[PDB]
């Protein structure tokens, strides 16, 4: 398959420089696309690496540099001074032949720009009670609070409990730290019979927490 392979996840501070890469293996042009978290696709610009002719979307002109090294079939997107608002996924796209534009896409490079620093989560119980019980069903969970950067993984009972589990998307707090909840609905008669443990892994901080959640 013709494919475009992008460079890995980036976590940067405001004012840092950054250069990300897009390599073709198996296009006479490469485009760049921004997708901010929870938002749609935005066209940034294009380069023809044969002679490095570039064009920028007026929104991106002077905000980023597109470049290429034809000798190694690689294109780049470079910032001299990152902003928090540069937090996004970046995709490169190209054309596997002369008739089908944008048929090849890179897998995307996730870039986080924040003043926050690497931090493992606090894992708090969301205890089942009468305030979380509805006709024989109880809800319980874990609040996975104040971590940076994404992502975290959550399982229940080491992956044995999957039915009725809702693990929410994280929210970014005004502190610059993420928070997410994971909940499960269970028979209220199981409380006190079945142990419920949320297994939390935050690889960026090497944090692993197993939190027992009891009534």
């Amino acid at each position: 398959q013709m494919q475009l392979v992008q460079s890995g996840t980036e976590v940067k501070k405001p004012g840092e420089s950054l250069k990300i890469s897009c390599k073709g293996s198996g296009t006479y042009w490469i485009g760049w696309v921004r997708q901010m978290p929870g938002k749609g696709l935005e066209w940034m610009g294009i380069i023809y690496p044969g002679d490095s002719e570039t064009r920028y979307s007026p929104s991106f002109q002077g905000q980023v540099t597109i470049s290429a090294d034809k000798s190694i079939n690689t294109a780049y997107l470079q910032w001299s001074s990152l902003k928090a608002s540069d937090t996004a996924i970046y995709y490169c796209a190209g054309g596997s032949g002369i008739s089908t534009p944008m048929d090849v896409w890179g897998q995307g490079t996730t870039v986080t720009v924040s003043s926050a620093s690497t931090k493992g989560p606090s894992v708090f119980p969301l205890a089942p009670s009468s305030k979380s019980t509805s006709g024989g069903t109880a809800a319980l969970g874990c609040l996975v609070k104040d971590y940076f950067p994404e992502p975290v993984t959550v399982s229940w009972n080491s992956g044995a409990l999957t039915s009725g589990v809702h693990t929410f998307p994280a929210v970014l707090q005004s502190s610059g730290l993420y928070s997410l909840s994971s909940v499960v609905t269970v028979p209220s008669s199981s409380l006190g019979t079945q142990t419920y443990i949320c297994n939390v892994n935050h690889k960026p901080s090497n944090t692993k927490v197993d939190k027992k959640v009891e009534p």
Partner: protein
């Protein structure tokens, strides 16, 4: 730049339905229009180029139509793998601008949420904060309003929410809202309430507790 308008922003459909979604360009772009599919956590995939040409490997239930300013993407018989977000993009004039996307979600009947409230843990209070979590479980459609009240005072600026992707089994959504206060602020108030508004409820549902009760 060319403005691309997609309609609708989201639509609900059943497996086997014929689904159309529209894309308008702010000037004629002839037949220079691509359609993409995107699923959560994945790169966009080209379905259709030149307004009506199927990309290799795309199922023949997908078709495109239109020329000039007004374009459509039709799925003749919607399959479970087709619930996704769709984008159009003009390929005529740089910059090659995108539409804002149309999400195709699964249609089901209205389902009221089950509402659960969770007081802060002693572990968190010792650490200096108080989070109160309001869970709206397994409802439809996605639109819901959660209001926090502390001693019957409406809160602003101190809560955040997020919603799950539609469950592929029962086609419902769930929503978590977190009210976060300082430990000092939490200790000054008695009654913590989340008030839920949803199409499935004939009137708002309040779940509440009294601090230390």
């Amino acid at each position: 730049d060319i403005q691309m308008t997609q309609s609708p922003s989201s639509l609900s459909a059943s497996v086997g339905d014929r689904v159309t979604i529209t894309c308008r360009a702010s000037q004629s772009i002839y037949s220079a229009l691509n359609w993409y599919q995107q699923k959560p956590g994945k790169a966009p995939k080209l379905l259709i180029y030149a307004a009506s040409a199927l990309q290799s490997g795309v199922p023949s239930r997908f078709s495109g139509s239109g020329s000039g300013t007004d374009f459509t993407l039709t799925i003749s018989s919607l399959q479970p793998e087709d619930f996704a977000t769709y984008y159009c993009q003009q390929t005529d004039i740089h910059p090659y601008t995108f539409g804002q996307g149309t999400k195709v979600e699964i249609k089901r009947t209205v389902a009221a949420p089950s509402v659960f409230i969770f007081p802060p843990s002693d572990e968190q209070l010792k650490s200096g904060t108080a989070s109160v979590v309001c869970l709206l479980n397994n409802f439809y459609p996605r639109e819901a309003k959660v209001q926090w009240k502390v001693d019957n005072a409406l809160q602003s600026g101190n809560s955040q929410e997020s919603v799950t992707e539609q469950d592929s089994k029962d086609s419902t959504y769930s929503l978590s809202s977190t009210l976060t206060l300082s430990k000092a602020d939490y200790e000054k108030h008695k009654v913590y309430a989340c008030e839920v508004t949803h199409q499935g409820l004939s009137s708002p549902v309040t779940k509440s507790f009294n601090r230390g009760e």
